[PDB]
Amino acid sequence: MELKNSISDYTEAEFVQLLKEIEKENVAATDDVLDVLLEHFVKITEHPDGTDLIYYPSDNRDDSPEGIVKEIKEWRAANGKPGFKQ
Amino acid sequence: MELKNSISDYTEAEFVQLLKEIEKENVAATDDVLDVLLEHFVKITEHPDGTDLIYYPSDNRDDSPEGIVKEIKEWRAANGKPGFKQ
Structure with a gap:
């Protein structure tokens, strides 16, 4: 599994x-790896909504992988934080 | 990566x-692993439509993971072949 240190080390x-x-991992028999991936996701995105970006997407946004990416990109840009790598 | 010998070794x-x-692997930079997964998928499902089950889902069916599963389950049952493990 790939796990990088920060948002800026990842391409979209x-x-x-x-x-x-x-x-x-959501359909994994056990939650062992899932909790690791979810903890990591929260730590590196630093987004106020945490895992809700995954389980409870906003009604005005695309419930998809690229949709989460867009969400993160915008929040980080509005806050002056480094975004994704190119 | 998990790769089992046949459809019957997999649970849904x-x-x-x-x-x-x-x-x-569809968003992987390279196709090396993707072609392996796709070759395997075709060999074990033995479904007439091959990878089309993924890229060109029938209009009358759910374009989703469980949707493909259902498709396979039904085709195998109509042909008297062993299905998924329980």
């Missing part, structure tokens, strides 16, 4: 791959 | 996890 596609890994 | 959820792995 690589971040989408972390989100697919999380999608895969 | 484990098969859904193979499908998520394939979803992840």
Whole structure:
């Protein structure tokens, strides 16, 4: 599994791959890896809504991997924090 | 990555996890792993439509992981072949 130190080390596609890994662990028999992926996701995005970005997408936004990416990108830009790698 | 010998060794959820792995490789920089997952998917499902089950879902069916699972389950049952493990 890929786990990078911060949002800026990920390209959008690589971040989408972390989100697919999380999608895969949602149907895992156990939660061991899922909790690790979810803890990591929260630590690195630093988004106020945490895992809600995944389970409770806003009604005005695309409930999809790229949709989460967009959400993060915008929040970080509005706050003057480094975004995704190019 | 999990790769089992046949459809009957997979539970529906484990098969859904193979499908998520394939979803992840679609955004991979390279196709090396993707072609392996896709070759495997075709060999074990033995479904006439091959990878079209993924890229070109029928209009009358749910374009989702469980949707593919249902499709496979039905085709195998109509042909008297062993299905998923319980």
